[PDB]
């Protein structure tokens, strides 16, 4: 698709399912990383995107936006988390210096004020779909009015290296349940391929 | 957005970036899991989706489709991989029996024949965007012509339990670099919060 809501494609909101400040921020961050790199969105498996967040962080919606803006998705094996707890992305394409993008602390301080209504709802436990548009639309409008430079900082990293997980497409029927199992995940039980649930159980 | 290409929303293809058989299969699987469960797409953080694939499996594009169909995304903390190497999903909403959906081996055998052109290109190393439409469009048309029952099997699991990762939104300025760091990922160095890169380096 192709049409914008608060400067973010409408499709990105349909993927994510709701309006919140972090998915747009992640989208903006991913777009900015590409602009800096002089790259277009990734259609295939060439460029890597690493988020500095961890699974324990709230606001992981940032990662949906980042994947959405760059085409470096978790499913394609191009998106991963480093676990540092920072609102930052590292775009890396082998043979080039990686680009790190960080959301400014000063932007975060202003977002806390600007989006206090939205965050008060979230603190009480209301899911984003239950939050009134008046509490979120002005925040997204504000974010869309800012230049990339007002939200983010960046730098090139010199010695960055990253080797992704080695992938394998071969499959074999599990000896116990009969289901096709990717060889990479099959266990051997007396010379026969067995899926993990049947091996360990 | 809202318009279909081969029975899959056009937006899902823009997110993923290219045409391949597995993203649509994952989309179909996720949609079927919801239909069986009697649930609508997840706008927020209520339902969990677990893929039985691992990061070492080729065809992880299945996972983009699954997230896209269900609204159970990796960014929202609702999507995870179990690492069994099966083309299967488990939809789970606390207080109900989980639903497991498996892509039939027989469907996989027919896909190998039906999509031999596409897979020959992939075996040579051509990325999906470089593959001619004639090698992929008839495969997607075929998939759209099949009923859910022709592609998948399902079952309810009785004793399924899953506790997601405990999340925390609090942040503190790292004592060394000054960057806001989610407390959940901060290290303590003589009573001061330090981000992992500054702690370990
Ligand atoms: Zn969100
Ligand atoms: Zn910074
Ligand atoms: Zn107010
Ligand atoms: Zn609620
Ligand atoms: Zn098995
Ligand atoms: Zn794909
Ligand atoms: Zn089966
Ligand atoms: Zn041919
Ligand atoms: Zn190529
Ligand atoms: Zn630090």
Burial of B103 (0-12, 13-18, 19+ CB in 10 A): buried
Is A18 in the B-facing interface, judged by CB distances under 8 Å?
Answer: yes
Strand partners, A187: A194
Going from the C-alpha of A70 to that of each of A10, A47, A108, B66, B151, the distances in angstroms are 16, 9, 23, 19, 31
**B119: closest CA among B184, B59, B187?**
B59
Q: Which CATH superfamily is domain A2-21+104-146 in?
A: pa2218 like domain (1.10.3320.10)
Domain with CATH 3.30.60.20 in chain B: 168-201
The DSSP line for B116-184 is: HHHHHHHHHT--GGGS-HHHHHHHHHHHHHS-HHHHEEEEEESS----PPPPB--EEE-TTT--EEEGG
Quick one: closest CA in B to A59, which residue? B169
User: How do the residues of chain B divide into helix, strand and coil, expressed in percent and rounded to 5?
Assistant: 40, 20, 40
Q: How far is the CA of A119 from the CAs of A66, B75, B130, B169, in angstroms?
A: 21, 18, 44, 11
Q: Which residue has the tokens 């002005």?
A: A138
Taking the centre of ligand 4 as the mean of its atom positions, its distance from the CA of residue A124, in whole angstroms, is: 9
Q: Which of B63, B10, B17 is nearest to A47 (CA)?
A: B17
Residues A91-118: b if buried by 16+ CB within 10 A, e if exposed: bbeeeeebbbbbbbeebeeebeebbeeb
Neighbouring C-alpha atoms within 13 Å toward the C-beta of A145: 7
Distances (CA, A) of A4 to A24, A144, B99: 11, 11, 36
Q: Which residues of chain B form CATH 1.10.3320.10?
A: 2-21+104-146
CB contacts < 8 A (A, B): 222
Q: How far is the CA of B12 from the centre of ligand 7 (A)?
A: 25
On whether the CB atoms of residues A195 and B52 are closer than 8 A, the answer is: no
CATH class held by domain A168-201: alpha beta
Method: X-ray
Write the burial class of residue B99 (CB in 10 Å: 0-12 exposed, 13-18 middle, 19+ buried): buried
Name the segment(s) of chain A with CATH classification 3.30.1330.20. 22-103+147-161
Cβ–Cβ under 8 Å, residues B31 and B154: no
Residue the block writes with tokens 């992992």: B196
* Longest Cα separation, chain A: 64
Resolution value, angstrom units: 1.9
Distance from the alpha carbon of residue A186 to the mean position of ligand 1, in angstroms = 36
- B85 and chain A in contact, CB less than 8 A: yes
Chain A residues whose beta carbon lies within 8 Å of the beta carbon of residue B2: 14
Q: How far is CA B100 from the centre of its chain?
A: 14
Determine contact: A11 vs chain B, CB below 8 A. Answer: yes
Ligand found nearest the CA of B109: 7
Coil, strand, or helix at residue A98?
strand
Which residues on neighbouring strands pair with residue A47, listed in sequence order?
Answer: none
In angstroms, the separation between the Cα of residue B184 and the nearest Cα of chain A is 6
Residue A72 CB contacts under 8 Å (≥ 6 apart), including other chains:
A30, A42, A47, A48, A49, A66, A78, A79, A91
Residues A1 and A20: their CA atoms lie apart, in Å, by: 21
φ and ψ of B19, to 5 deg: -100, 130
**A98 DSSP β-pair partners:** A157
With H, G, I as helix, E, B as strand and everything else as coil, classify residue A49: strand
Q: Are B66 and B79 in contact (CB under 8 A)?
A: yes
Q: Which CATH class is domain A22-103+147-161?
A: alpha beta
Among candidate residues B123, B142, B131, B119, the one with its CA nearest the CA of residue A43? B131
What would the two tokens of residue B75 be? 């960014």
Smallest Cα–Cα separation from A20: which of A8, A33, A35, A34?
A: A8
| HSE-CB of B147 using CA atoms within 13 angstroms | 3
Are A127 and B60 inside 8 Å of each other by CB? no
């Amino acid at each position: 698709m192709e049409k914008l809501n608060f400067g973010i494609p409408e499709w990105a909101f349909e993927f994510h399912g709701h309006k919140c400040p972090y998915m747009p921020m992640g989208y903006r961050a991913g777009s900015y990383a590409l602009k800096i790199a002089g790259l277009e969105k990734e259609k295939d498996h060439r460029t890597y995107l690493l988020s500095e967040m961890s699974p324990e962080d709230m606001n992981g919606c940032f990662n949906d936006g980042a994947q959405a803006a760059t085409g470096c998705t978790y499913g394609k094996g191009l998106f991963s988390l480093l676990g540092y707890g920072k609102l930052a992305l590292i775009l890396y394409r082998p043979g080039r210096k990686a680009i790190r993008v960080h959301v400014r602390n000063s932007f975060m301080d202003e977002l806390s004020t600007r989006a206090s209504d939205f965050f008060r709802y979230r603190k009480q436990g209301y899911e984003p779909s239950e939050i009134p548009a008046g509490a979120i639309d002005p925040v997204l409008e504000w974010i869309s009015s800012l230049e990339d430079e007002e939200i983010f900082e960046y730098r090139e990293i010199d010695g960055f290296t990253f080797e992704p997980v080695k992938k394998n497409g071969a499959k074999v029927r599990c000896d116990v349940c009969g289901e096709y199992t990717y060889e990479a995940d099959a266990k051997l039980l007396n010379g026969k391929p067995v899926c993990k649930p049947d091996y360990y159980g």
